[PDB]
């Protein structure tokens, strides 16, 4: 029945705004991803049957966590659509499709716990995956649903193209590890500064993609102020859960994860925009200037968080 889905006509335009909120369209979200794949990769880019199977199974394999759920895969999926539709002769076909898949899958089977939590308490996952722990998992989940029968959508294409869309997908998933993002954005800055970028350089494109993935991952902060505010509530409800179990293991969680410090959430929202969010969308704009609305909205929300703190 995901093949019988057709997107309402009035939405066709609204989806194309960077600021678009998928929030109120929960039933349509998988067809919303179908729509987006068929507009930037074309219908008949996959066999329909296996593309609807691969989608609902990925939904099945996202947990009922507060933030890193199905809603977030699709939201990031959207942001990637928006960036590729505003940059379309820059990215090949195997990037445009790999990256729409990568986004939809980038947090597969999140358990709402941070890399550090896993690493701090000897989780089985940080035993297999020692650094960038959840992302090595999210990419292991992704392959696992691809290799199910009736699920390999890249199967009908060359194995040299098939390993490329594997290795594009891997990187973008790992890139959503915000700890690596800092080095990536500072390295991109110099190459811009020194005029040493080269989009012919396959290792430079890899960085630029990773920037895009971080922007897409963080794009909750690029909505209209009512949308952004209500997503904060989801974000901390998960951080707070990871705080909670640290308070059962005797340890005082970091303020970000401390429900009992609620009055400082506005303060850290400003510190987060200024230390991560503005830097990210600033470099991504210097690099892809059609994606300046991501930058402008992030600034708009910064103003609002400013207005919360001041009580203005
Ligand atoms: C009371 C309080 C205090 C601090 C809070 C805080 C609340 N909320 C945040 C950040 C909310 C956040 C985190 C991640 C993704 C979002 C997307 C949208 C909105 N928010 C968020 N932070 C915050 C903001 C800025 C900096 C900060 O730095 C801590 C160091 C973390 N760095 C380095 C280590 N890597 C793993 C993560 C980034 C923490
Ligand atoms: Mg992640
Ligand atoms: Zn994510």
Curated annotation (Swiss-Prot):
Coiled-coil blocks: none
Catalytic site: 68
Binding site for a divalent metal cation 2: 107
Boundaries of the shown chain within the full protein: 724 to 1035 of 1055
Subunit organization: Homodimer.
Chain's role: Plays a role in signal transduction by regulating the intracellular concentration of cyclic nucleotides. Can hydrolyze both cAMP and cGMP, but has higher affinity for cAMP and is more efficient with cAMP as substrate. May play a critical role in regulating cAMP and cGMP levels in the striatum, a region of the brain that contributes to the control of movement and cognition.
Protein's organism: Homo sapiens (Human)
Localization (cell): Cytoplasm, Cytosol
Tissue: Abundant in the putamen and caudate nucleus regions of brain and testis, moderately expressed in the thyroid gland, pituitary gland, thalamus and cerebellum.
The protein, known as: cAMP and cAMP-inhibited cGMP 3',5'-cyclic phosphodiesterase 10A
């Amino acid at each position: 029945g995901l093949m019988q889905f057709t997107l309402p006509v009035r939405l066709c335009k609204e989806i194309e705004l960077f600021h678009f909120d998928i929030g109120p369209f929960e039933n349509m979200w998988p067809g919303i991803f179908v729509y987006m794949v068929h507009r930037s990769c074309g219908t008949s880019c996959f066999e329909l049957e296996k593309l609807c199977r691969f989608i609902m199974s990925v939904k099945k394999n996202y947990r009922r966590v507060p933030y890193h759920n199905w809603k977030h895969a699709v939201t990031v999926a959207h942001c990637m659509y928006a960036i590729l539709q505003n940059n379309h002769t820059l990215f090949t076909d195997l990037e445009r499709k790999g990256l729409l898949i990568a986004c939809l899958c980038h947090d597969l089977d999140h358990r709402g716990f941070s890399n550090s939590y896993l690493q701090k308490f000897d989780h089985p996952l940080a035993a297999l995956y020692s650094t960038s722990t959840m992302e090595q998992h999210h990419f292991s989940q992704t392959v696992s649903i691809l290799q199910l029968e009736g699920h390999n959508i890249f199967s009908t294409l060359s194995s040299s193209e098939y390993e490329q869309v594997l290795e594009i997908i891997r990187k973008a998933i790992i890139a959503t590890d915000l700890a690596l993002y800092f080095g990536n954005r500072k390295q991109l800055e110099e190459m811009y500064q020194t005029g040493s970028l080269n989009l012919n350089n396959q290792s430079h494109r890899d960085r630029v993609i990773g920037l895009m993935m971080t922007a897409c991952d963080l794009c909750s902060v690029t909505k209209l102020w009512p949308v952004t505010k209500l997503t904060a509530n989801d974000i901390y409800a998960e951080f707070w859960a990871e705080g909670d179990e640290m308070k059962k293991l005797g340890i005082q969680p970091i303020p970000m994860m401390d429900r009992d410090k609620k009055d400082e959430v506005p303060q850290g929202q400003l510190g987060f925009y200024n230390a991560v969010a503005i830097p990210c969308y600033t470099t991504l704009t210097q690099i892809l200037p059609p994606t300046e609305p991501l930058l402008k909205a992030c600034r708009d929300n910064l103003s609002q968080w400013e207005k919360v703190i001041r009580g203005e």
